[PDB]
Design a protein around this ligand. Structure first.
Ligand code: ADP
Ligand code: MG
Lengths: 49, 49
C-alpha cells in the first residue's frame, strides 16, 4: 500500500484504505477483479481514490 | 474477488430491525380471491401448463 494523498481532499476510512490497497495491486499486475464490497461502505470513494 | 461486510464497520452502525405486519384481507378482497380461485379451477389453474 503506497498511496498518494494528492487530490484527496476528502477523508477515507481504514477499510477504505485497505480496499484501495487491494485495488492498486490489480492495476499494477494488469489484472481485473470484482469489487463485491457491501453496499454503503463508500465504493464510489474507492473508485475516486 | 474482494468482499467486505458491515461487521468490519460495526460497533458504530445503528442496529437494524425487521418487523412482520399481518393484514386481514377485506371482505370484497376475500370474495374476489375466492371467485378467481374458482375461475382458475374452471381453468384448471394452469398449474401444470
Ligand atoms: N470517507 C467518507 N466521508 C464522508 N462520506 C462518505 C465517506 N465514504 C462514504 N461516504 C458516503 O457513503 C456513500 C457511499 O455511496 P457509494 O460509494 O456511491 O455506494 P455504496 O453506498 O455502495 O458505498 C456516499 O453517498 C458518501 O456520501
Ligand atoms: Mg457507490
Amino acid at each position: 500500500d503506497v498511496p498518494v494523498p494528492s487530490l484527496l481532499r476528502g477523508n477515507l476510512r481504514t477499510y477504505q484504505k485497505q480496499g484501495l490497497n487491494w485495488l492498486a495491486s490489480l492495476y499494477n499486475n494488469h489484472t481485473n477483479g470484482i469489487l463485491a464490497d457491501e453496499m454503503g461502505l463508500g465504493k464510489t470513494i474507492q473508485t475516486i481514490s | 474477488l474482494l468482499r467486505r461486510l458491515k461487521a468490519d464497520v460495526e460497533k458504530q452502525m445503528p442496529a437494524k430491525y425487521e418487523h412482520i405486519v399481518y393484514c386481514k384481507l377485506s371482505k370484497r378482497q376475500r370474495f374476489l380471491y375466492d371467485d378467481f380461485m374458482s375461475r382458475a379451477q374452471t381453468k384448471a389453474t394452469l398449474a401444470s401448463g
